[PDB]
Symmetry: C6
Subunit: 193 residues, 6 copies
């Protein structure tokens, strides 16, 4: 769990919000994603079927309705959110090594910039999820008219309800993280002056 707290963004300049609350939500998102990755999204494409005899209609309809899986989006979001924290950690390690082989304001500014970048990454991933999948709920039946499917065909999604439940969990966690990051930057600015 120490690696997870390192990836969260725990810093010596971090207050209680960034040190005890943000890291726990980060670990919670990691655990939920690990639980839901291959158990419920594993057969998303192999169990996707359409009512037709046309060869190749299943693959094109699946690609049309799921340009990128929810799990891959969440994985990319977690990686990009954790990147600035380890960037700051490597910078601190470099500074300590330089000190050993031979200010605090630079650390403070680096921390606030990294928090701002985390907030931006979370916001943009929320926006792209809203663009791709406007509704938080997943439906059982979809209508597909992409070539080579003739006219319109009915296709059926695997495990819509369980996927909806996990989507609600993940979106709520992301929203909480956004609120906590905004509170963190505001608190740091207030403490500065």
């Amino acid at each position: 769990t120490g690696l997870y707290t390192l990836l969260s963004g725990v810093n010596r300049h971090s207050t209680a919000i960034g040190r005890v609350w943000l890291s726990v939500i980060f670990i919670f998102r990691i655990m939920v994603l690990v639980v839901a990755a291959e158990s419920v999204w594993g057969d998303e494409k192999s169990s996707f079927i359409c009512n037709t005899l046309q060869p190749g209609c299943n693959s094109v309809c699946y690609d049309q309705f799921f340009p990128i899986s929810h799990v891959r989006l969440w994985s990319l979001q977690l990686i990009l959110v954790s990147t600035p924290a380890l960037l700051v950690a490597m910078h601190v390690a470099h500074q300590q090594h330089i000190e050993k082989k031979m200010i605090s304001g630079t650390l403070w500014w680096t921390y606030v910039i990294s928090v701002v970048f985390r907030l931006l990454f979370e916001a943009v991933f929320m926006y792209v999820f809203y663009l791709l999948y406007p509704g938080y709920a997943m439906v059982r039946l979809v209508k597909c008219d992409v070539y080579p499917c003739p006219n319109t065909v009915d296709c059926f999604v695997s495990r819509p309800t369980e996927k909806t439940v996990f989507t609600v969990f993940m979106l709520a966690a992301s929203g909480i993280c956004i609120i906590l990051n905004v509170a963190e930057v505001v608190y740091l600015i207030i403490r500065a002056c």
Copy 2:
């Protein structure tokens, strides 16, 4: 096992009940879930079949009768139950770091609040399991009339008896945990006055 005892909620203010009994039941639930996750619930959907020629009826009937798998419910319950313990642990680490870089009542109140939250999470997960699956036993044959299935169709469940056995084990463990948490809060309150 040390990580498991940390996730259980072992604290310096914990009595014998919370330190030697609750953690063991937590580890027992973890081990049973690990044993039963993919061995018996792995083919829940791929082996689910219905007596019909209608395309898409298997998937919609499976989604209707199993909105969320038992294993996923137990995994979410374990994650949410273990969250407050590591929240308390991170708060203790933060307090110790603050002391290093420069009371007991706060620790006591944090511990009692975390125990209450664990009790609430266990109770709400028991209630939601009762709502979704009223009977502890799983049946071999189910009747499905969801669109697009015509009229009513017969569908067959994989491994009903083994799933019933593991459900009984998990429910008994959860009930024991609830009783132990109630005893813990009562004992702490009694020792307080």
Copy 3:
């Protein structure tokens, strides 16, 4: 292997029988179960076939003849047998922590009670295995008349001979463990007076 010896029940009051013989048999059972879990019992249900055209007869016949797999029974037996040892270990750790932050008879009684509980768990699992599967051998062909199968159908089991061999190994190991536990309690009682 140290974790396995801890799970066996090695204690400072343990004699040679409980310290050098019981733990080795415990590790042997763990290793045999790990070898045989998914190699030979992996396709128990997917390769189970019956001579019929009736939909759903394979699943109901498999559920009728295998209410719970042998591997899951052995896993549950190992978990329940190892539970009292780690309960005792956690109690000892709690006692030592209490001593650090500030008798032998309590340890002796706890050890004998844990050994008795291990003996009881092994005996009850042997009895339930005898109830479910009276014969140690597994047959190639079974006769199934459960609804919806019409009349009686023939069904065929995967790898009967290899499963029989591993069943003999596991039963012999369990019997040896029972005998050793009885010898342990008798020896401790004799040394007491």
Copy 4:
């Protein structure tokens, strides 16, 4: 993560660019590849289908259109890029062992040569990717006329859009790495004189 930073090429003569920026991009590429390896490229061939009754046409068309998978190309690129860094590390360990059992310019020249070799490997892998797959986007339908397929047949690709997204990510990361390596060699040369 320490092994990853070692494989990146962190050296005592490295500046900030090579120590805190290049290593993070290396770890980012590793993580994205781990996420995308078997999740989205796992069923590239088993789900590849063509509209024909000719036996063997699926395999020959897949081999014609995908001589080597994107994931394998990226894996080989990462291995070859990380080779000179560990070569330098082993040379440093050998030099230190020789010193223990009994100049800086040799280390400086070895570092600059290793950086040049990393730049060359990244450039050649970019060029070979451009040769094999000129467009960054993947199409849904391809036309195949390789023997034994009669005339021309239509074949359908699995998950074109998700693969396009991950390809864009990987190409952008590789370009950033190339730019950073060029900046590193230029900065080292400038500091030399």
Copy 5:
């Protein structure tokens, strides 16, 4: 590798033969078994087919011709061969603990008895392999007349040649181990007098 050398039977009374040669062959057998377990024996039963329309003939013929897989036999042989070494190690640990909380001949006799038991286990497993599979080579086609197969049917084995190669490797390694154990006991007896 330290655990492997412990399982081999390295003891303070061991000579060069038992300390540097037997352990290497043990590790070699472990590595070859790990390589060949699921790569070449993984599809032994799923790819086994017979030329018939009779339901259930494939399973009964496979069970008749392969009562227990070669890989499972080798796994059991390795476990049973490694058991006496860890029994001796646990006895030594028990003796040292007894010394700490408060002769060499006992250690010498325990070592020679354990070597004899290892020799016996290897010999009996060689004999049982000879009984089950008289020829070291595996054939492509087998003739099966077990009920319910009508008359005699032809069945085909997966990867006969690769399995033959690995069988030759494993048998040669086992024979070398037997010879080395005999040399070890003879050398110890000679050194005794």
Copy 6:
């Protein structure tokens, strides 16, 4: 990576060639084999198809044309090449233990003998690969006339081009290793006199 360098054959008498160059090539071969084992050779037999209705022709033709897979050959080669290095390491550990409980020429001769044995193993595996697969390239279509296939049938290979690429990589690495071993023995002999 330390275990890999130990398996390479790094010794206190090793020069730069054996200490910094041979070990890197060994690790490179290990990594390439790990990447290519199950990704590209995983479906070698399940996707192998022939244009016929004869039962059992696919398996016999696959066995005829691929007596042993390339990946298994490379795995065996790596194991046998790494065996003498760990034999020498265990001999050194035995010598140091003997010294602790109570010359350099023996170490020198052991090192040169181990290098010669590594060279011999690499050469013989190269020769056997040349015998089994004379051409470095793999073809799409093969002609099979083994019983029970009637007359001659066409069979199709999975991923010929990617397998050719990885074969070229592995053969080049093995040739480099052979050249480096010859240079090592020549350099040691020259330094001796």
